[PDB]
Amino acid sequence: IVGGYTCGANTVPYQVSLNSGYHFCGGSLINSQWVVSAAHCYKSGIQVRLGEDNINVVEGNEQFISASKSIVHPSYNSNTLNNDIMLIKLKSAASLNSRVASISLPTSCASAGTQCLISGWGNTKSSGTSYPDVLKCLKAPILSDSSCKSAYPGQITSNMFCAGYLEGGKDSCQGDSGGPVVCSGKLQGIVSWGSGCAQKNKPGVYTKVCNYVSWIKQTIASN
Amino acid sequence: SSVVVDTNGQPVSNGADAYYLVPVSHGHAGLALAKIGNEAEPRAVVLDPHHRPGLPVRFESPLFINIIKESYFLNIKFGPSSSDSGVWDVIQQDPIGLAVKVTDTKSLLGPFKVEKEGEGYKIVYYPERGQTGLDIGLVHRNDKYYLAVKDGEPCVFKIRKAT
């Protein structure tokens, strides 16, 4: 997150880290035993940290639970980046507290111009790299699909939306992939991709979660 | 689709870090620029026996992740991360053929992938994302190995972080 702020302990309790000896992706806790992240974050034997705000501390009201299942969307299109959604079943339900709680799935799709909260531990610089210790946060509005397809000719599918600033300054960045985009208290997006970080006319692209709730609910039902 | 790994067993970063490509078949060879055809300025990407450990590259993906998977379509570039010079592409040019060259623009998604090959990695060029790959190898011409499409005959690299 570039141009963001320190979230605070307790501020984003549905944020998780995907870990395999190091942090590589954000995720979203959607119930005590189910996490959403990006299909492009898929990795063998992922371990989920929950209740972490400082990513470089070994204790602090935290939980470290192995994936029992990592289920990428069966239409995940690694050529087009389409259907960039993954569900992780945890091996055991998380214990809930001030720093660990679920986000809910949206009733309906969020409309262009709605303000959202994006969070993660990715790079905080536009040119160079600075990784934060603490979770960072950004309020980013949703852009029209015409604005989005314009920014990225040929690449914006129906299962993607753009959020952020075509003016520059503020965006997701490397290491934020798979993290939450929350609008009106619902998970509307998953951090996917963009041309650089915080550049003019090059906003963030997010997986449109409202399109996937039937699948998620059905995948939870059956697994 | 595994994670690309440097020689110290660390995942290769998305743009943050530069890496020497180290051939395992040409100890004295390193990456550099050469002229091709009629060009005043060197724009073709060569291995030079006269030049180890080489000019370093960055592997760049639009995905908001700081690891590179063998499955990610990449931009490969000489020079600084954000900058838009030294971006690799393939150009049909004599006397070399489908030559790896540098240019001043960048696409959203590069045409290159890094792939496990026997004991190391090869660069694979994809003319389009749906299609199978063309291994990058070497054309020995005028005393140097120009990188170029030679499918079935890849050049094998280890990826040493420049540090």
- Per the entry, the structure determination technique was X-ray
Alpha carbon distance A37, A65 (integer Å): 15
* Shortest distance, CA B74 to any CA of chain A (angstroms): 12
A23 is catalytic: no
- For A222, list phi and psi in degrees, rounded to 5: -85, -10
Measured CA to CA, the distance from residue A199 to residue A187 in angstroms comes to 25
What topology does CATH give the domain A15-102+212-222?
Thrombin, subunit H (2.40.10)
In angstroms, the CA A169 to CA A4 distance is: 9
Reported residue count of chain B is: 163
| In chain A, domain spans | 5-7+103-211, 15-102+212-222
Q: How many CB pairs under 8 A join A and B?
A: 65
State the resolution, in angstroms.
2.0
Q: Count CB-CB contacts under 10 A for residue B152.
A: 7
In CATH terms, are A5-7+103-211 and A15-102+212-222 the same topology? yes
**Half-sphere exposure in the Cβ direction for B101 (13 Å, CA):** 19
Q: B105 touching A, CB under 8 A?
A: no
Please list every residue in chain A whose beta carbon sits closer than 8 Å to the beta carbon of residue B74: none
Single-letter amino acid, residue B160? R
- Which own/partner contact pairs does A44-49 have at CB distance under 8 Å and 24+ positions apart? A44/A20, A44/A70, A45/A20, A46/A18, A46/A19, A46/A20, A46/A70, A46/A88, A47/A18, A47/A19, A47/A20, A48/A16, A48/A17, A48/A18, A48/A19, A48/A88, A48/A90, A49/A16, A49/A17, A49/A19, A49/A23
Distance of alpha carbon B69 from alpha carbon B114, whole angstroms: 8
Q: How many CB atoms lie within 10 A of CB A56?
A: 10
DSSP string, A96-163: PBTTB-PPBPPSSPPPTT-EEEEEESS---SSS----SB-EEEEEEB--HHHHHHHSTTT--TTEEEE
CA distance A159 to A84: 8
Whole-number Å distance between alpha carbons of A54 and A60: 9
* Tokens at B105, concatenated: 């623009």
Tokens found for residue A16: 């998780």
Residue A84 is among the residues annotated as catalytic for this protein: yes
State both tokens at B99: 């030559």
Question: First CA to last CA across chain B, in angstroms?
Answer: 25
What is the number of other CB atoms lying within 10 angstroms of the CB of residue B117? 15
Question: Does the domain at residues A5-7+103-211 carry the CATH identifier 2.40.10.10?
Answer: yes
Q: What SS3 class is residue A73? A: coil
* Residue A40 bears catalytic tag: yes
B72 contacts in chain A (CB < 8 Å) = 40
> Which H or E run includes A213?
helix A213-222
b (16+ CB within 10 A) / e for A64-82: ebebeebbbbeebebebbb
Measured between alpha carbons, how far is B55 from B19 in angstroms, rounded to an integer?
9
- Alpha-carbon distance of B53 to B30, in angstroms, equals 5
Q: Among residues A17, A84, A102, A192, which one is catalytic?
A: A84
